[PDB]
């Protein structure tokens, strides 16, 4: 089982398009972290994404990652493509996809971690899944109606 | 974020229908556990599922659960419906759905935990997700071609 996907899906009381625009322009200050990096444009001058080098602390351990982020407004989807860092000691591929859709009924938010392990001895990224989950729960608790 | 779903999805080198029949009739002896219970029939005499009371040790702690299992051969789906036990101290609802499908390309196996927390102070079931993940990885490593 070398190729796989972990998912955490949450219901949020908020319109999908609004919530996506919030997620797209926001990060969890309690968590030690910062980034440096650049904005990417499509060629008309308006940002289409970013490339960031993160310095962060996960389960007590300091780590780095380089991620390229792209977005698709029409499907309310953010994609983080990790190319380098501590995660690449365990994974050949590590992508994080964030989707927001309206309930058939507010909204449903889906974090997916699409991964390929280096070898069988690599863990699956349950530590990252819980991290992203708690971060989006925290951000969702500071948003409210009206 | 009280209602949600956790998913672990794995690729396995095995035909989907065969793998489903394996999963359907198998349990991880390393893990302390046993069950008692009964078989359920649809009314023609052939088993359609089971109702089991599990005694198991999760992350060092002894727990119990009562689960009703049903299956759908045509969609290769097993459904475990938990009605009682330690998990119900955290969740109003706790269902585990196991699906096996062929790759568009072997197979893709999907464990989903569909949950509703009692309150905001309840955890999401990352401990169960990792447990089910490692159990299906273990079972998949003992299966091989030909």
Author numbering:
A (entry chain A), B (entry chain A): 8 to 34, 37 to 114, 117 to 157
Give the authors' words.
Several proteins from plant pathogenesis-related family 10 (PR10) are highly abundant in the latex of opium poppy and have recently been shown to play diverse and important roles in the biosynthesis of benzylisoquinoline alkaloids (BIAs). PR10-10 has been proposed to act as a noncatalytic BIA binding protein. We observed that an intermolecular disulfide bond between Cys59 and Cys155 is formed in the apo structure, while the binding of alkaloid compounds to the central hydrophobic pocket induces conformational changes that prevent the formation of this intermolecular disulfide bond.
To decouple ligand binding from disulfide-bond formation, each of the two highly conserved cysteine residues (Cys59 and Cys155) in PR10-10 was replaced with serine using site-directed mutagenesis. A crystal structure of the Cys155Ser mutant was also determined in the absence of exogenous BIA compounds. Attempts to crystallize the Cys59Ser and Cys155Ser mutants of PR10-10 in the absence of BIA ligands surprisingly yielded crystals with the morphology characteristic of PR10-10 with bound BIA ligands. Data processing confirms that these crystals show C2221 space-group symmetry, and structure determination and refinement reveal a closed cap-loop conformation similar to the structures of PR10-10 with bound BIA ligands. Despite the absence of exogenously added ligands during crystallization, there appears to be electron density in the hydrophobic pocket corresponding to an unidentified compound. Mutation of either Cys59 or Cys155 was associated with the binding of an unknown molecule in the absence of an alkaloid ligand, whereas similar conditions for the purification, storage and crystallization of wild-type PR10-10 resulted in the apo conformation. Although holo PR10-10 and cysteine-mutant PR10-10 structures all showed closed cap-loop conformations, and slight differences in the cap position from residues 37–40 were observed, it should be noted that residues 34–36 in wild-type PR10-10, residues 35–36 in PR10-10-Cys155Ser and residues 34–36 in PR10-10-Cys59Ser–papaverine were not sufficiently well ordered to be modeled. The PR10-10-Cys59Ser and PR10-10-Cys155Ser structures demonstrated a similar cap-loop conformation, which was fully modeled for PR10-10-Cys59Ser. Residues 38–40 were shifted ∼3.8 Å perpendicularly away from the central α2 helix in the PR10-10 cysteine mutants compared with wild-type holo PR10-10.
